Design a binder for this molecule. Structure first.
Ligand SMILES: Cc1cc2nc3c(=O)[nH]c(=O)nc-3n(C[C@H](O)[C@H](O)[C@H](O)COP(=O)(O)O)c2cc1C
Ligand SMILES: Cc1cc2nc3c(=O)[nH]c(=O)nc-3n(C[C@H](O)[C@H](O)[C@H](O)COP(=O)(O)O)c2cc1C
Ligand SMILES: [Mn+2]
Ligand SMILES: [Mn+2]
Ligand SMILES: [Mn+2]
Ligand SMILES: [Mn+2]
Lengths: 284, 129, 284, 129
């Protein structure tokens, strides 16, 4: 039944390439000096603090989903035994991402306010719908739809939350928290690339007409998740004037998620004009 | 003209296909011949690992090791992803500093329509000067 | 279905203890200078080289089994969300262990000799019988038996292979390979401890009648795998005079595997008296 | 008299039960503090890495920090696992070095029958000094 894995008998060179990239980029939240952000956490308003905790409690839920259900659901559909091993790394690192959010709470935040943010996330309708839609495709019978959902979640949907530490970084606030988030972002950039690459490889062994159906499904799923994420952004950033800037950052990342899957960008330049300070926070 | 490299994922390949301009590809196979006669701008993706970052792909190095190819190089465009931080388009400036050519443009993955528009206008104005 | 994980609301302290120990002990085969063992490898006899490759091809199969089926089969039976996250690390590190054997092959060995050793492993009856018994319980519907099989494999059975790098270490040969094996052993000691601890925690919720049923099963399975492992040792170490010391080392580790599950040692002192040079190689 | 610590896994606890000698346990609860009156040997498991980066459990540190208990310490026995290399039973020689007491014995997990018999003979012979 089970055969011994041979890393000197590589079928797809990308498997080894991504294995080496992900494993050598290993990190833990303890390696980041988060304690240096306490003086900066003080200067933030109650609104900004509340927004911060609600963002990370939301991201904790979705990273837990990727760890428990997300990555493992892709394993039976792996083309190579080396892909199975790479997915084991991906699953583990999702637990590291989710763990790192608790490290931010433990260092900077008060237990009372954190528990309130957890409760706020549980009752939030757009976050729960997002979780449900993505999870339903993971439990489905279509291997390719699982890959679409995974790419859409962490190459696009996550950036409604990722925007905040990037904005604080440009204002010179919570720089260490932003560094930790950039380590997560660096992981997800490879995750989306790899899963998207394996999506396109599996698209080669299906009919021309079936490719057109799945292209239509992808843009349908994107726009369903997009409409939901607009509501999620409105409810999160309600007490701030940043709503429009996050939505432009969403459209920008939505295009990148489509490019990972090998599709044309859907959103035009005028809808995807991100504040230059956010882009500079990504790439210094 | 244009010379480019693209891995089996083919992000740069799809960029050139949507660009429309005539270009020659540096072969994906390691042991294949590649020579160009007309002056060119190079388009390279970045592949930096960890410590000793080999951001420039092996095929591009083997291509630039040829003295005839290197002499016709005039500019470099970098492909990649902003999510890698300071390493965004790392292959661009590495070749730019080694070969003494200017680093012109940086884009992500297969490039948006804005990236295609900026390259078309950037390339044509570059050759006329 | 999915709840947001909270590492600041710990149910069982051991989950965090083991998470911290396993993650902070992260390593890769690339971090070990295996190429420095080339001179020592070339002083070995054809018998010794052949034995080394057959040992590691056998361990590759079993570690691949642990990555693909072993650790994932324990996930649905987790008591806490934190146990699920730790099992994600275990599963990934099983893939690292299997990958490290290929790193040894690529560095020291000839390709046709490695392929011959892989073929030998495929046609070896005791090795395949061992693989079938362990997978049988993994794909069963008794969660407690999966934990028993998992502890018996890597706290007991693996050591018929682990003996050799420790022997070479005692004679001052293949020291870097020995260092790599000690990193695998360091992982497996915690793996067996944790899985064994969770086995005991799960047995607190069942009747006395079922505990005695599982105890009788555990000892019967141990003797079944042991008798089969003696045959595996005889066939593996046929061209050497080391079989008797390997078997003594097997009985020593079998007692440790039982203790991880909370059972009294079964093998007496005279059967488990390991050559002190092997013990010194394990703990300098 | 023996003083011992054991975690929720209770490997050291099971060793003491099989030993057959009267022993007082250092409370698993960190808030609880205990005092002994007779001279004793201390039996400790090692927990280097993961816990507090140190080998000695926090409850044992609190036990020894009490000047009353430390003065009655006569010897130490370390528990652990040989698979941890140089760190095997490292809690023993840390307490032995810091308090100036002899490190008497090292054993693994819940201990073998040889370990039990060696500790039985060891302790009985020790208290004639
Ligand atoms: C292992 C690996 C390393 C990468 N390193 C970088 C990098 O350092 N900087 C960057 O901008 N992009 C990096 N990327 C992203 C690629 O450059 C990007 O996906 C590119 O569009 C691929 O082009 P291609 O498909 O034509 O080869 C990396 C991708 C991989 C798989
Ligand atoms: C996080 C962790 C760290 C450990 N570190 C060591 C160590 O450094 N040296 C050692 O000999 N054993 C070490 N061990 C093994 C334990 O000391 C051993 O299992 C002991 O029997 C536990 O006793 P207890 O269950 O009564 O607490 C460690 C175990 C854990 C879980
Ligand atoms: Mn993630
Ligand atoms: Mn991911
Ligand atoms: Mn293993
Ligand atoms: Mn294991």
């Amino acid at each position: 039944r089970i055969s011994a894995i041979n890393w000197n008998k590589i079928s797809d060179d990308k498997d080894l390439e991504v294995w080496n990239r992900l494993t050598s980029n290993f990190w833990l939240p303890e390696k980041v000096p988060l304690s240096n952000d306490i003086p900066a956490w003080q200067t933030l308003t109650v609104v900004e603090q509340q927004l911060t905790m609600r963002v990370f409690t939301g991201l904790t839920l979705l990273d837990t989903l990727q760890n428990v259900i997300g990555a493992p659901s892709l394993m039976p559909d792996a083309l190579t035994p080396h892909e199975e091993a790479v997915l084991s790394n991906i699953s583990f690192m999702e637990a590291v991402h989710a763990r790192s959010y608790s490290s931010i709470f433990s260092t900077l935040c008060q237990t009372k306010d954190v528990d309130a943010a957890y409760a706020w996330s549980e009752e939030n309708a757009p976050l729960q719908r997002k979780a449900q839609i993505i999870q339903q495709h993971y439990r489905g019978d279509d291997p390719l739809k699982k890959k679409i959902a995974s790419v859409f979640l962490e190459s696009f949907l996550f950036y409604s939350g990722f925007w905040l530490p990037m904005y604080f970084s440009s204002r010179g606030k919570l720089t260490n928290t932003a560094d930790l988030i950039r380590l997560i972002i660096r992981d997800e950039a490879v995750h989306g690339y790899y899963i998207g690459y394996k999506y396109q490889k599996n698209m080669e062994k299906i009919s021309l007409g079936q490719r057109e159906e799945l292209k239509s499904f992808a843009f349908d799923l994107l726009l369903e998740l997009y409409d939901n994420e607009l509501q999620y952004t409105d409810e999160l950033y309600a007490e701030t004037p940043w709503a429009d800037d996050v939505k432009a950052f969403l459209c920008y990342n939505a295009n990148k998620a489509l490019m990972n899957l090998g599709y044309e960008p859907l959103f035009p330049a005028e809808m995807a004009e991100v504040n230059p300070a956010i882009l500079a926070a990504l790439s210094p | 003209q244009l010379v480019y490299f693209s891995s089996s994922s083919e992000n740069t390949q799809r960029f050139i296909e949507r660009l429309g301009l005539p270009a020659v590809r540096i072969p994906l196979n390691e042991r294949e011949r590649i020579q160009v006669d007309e002056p060119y701008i190079l388009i390279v993706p970045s592949y930096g690992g960890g410590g000793t970052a080999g951001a420039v792909p092996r095929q591009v190095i083997r291509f630039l090791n040829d003295e005839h190819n290197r002499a016709l190089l005039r500019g470099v465009i970098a492909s990649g992803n902003r999510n890698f931080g300071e390493a965004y388009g790392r292959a661009g400036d590495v070749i730019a500093r080694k070969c003494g050519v200017p680093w012109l443009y940086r884009f992500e993955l297969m490039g948006t329509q804005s990236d295609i528009e900026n390259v078309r206008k950037g390339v044509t104005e570059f050759w006329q000067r």
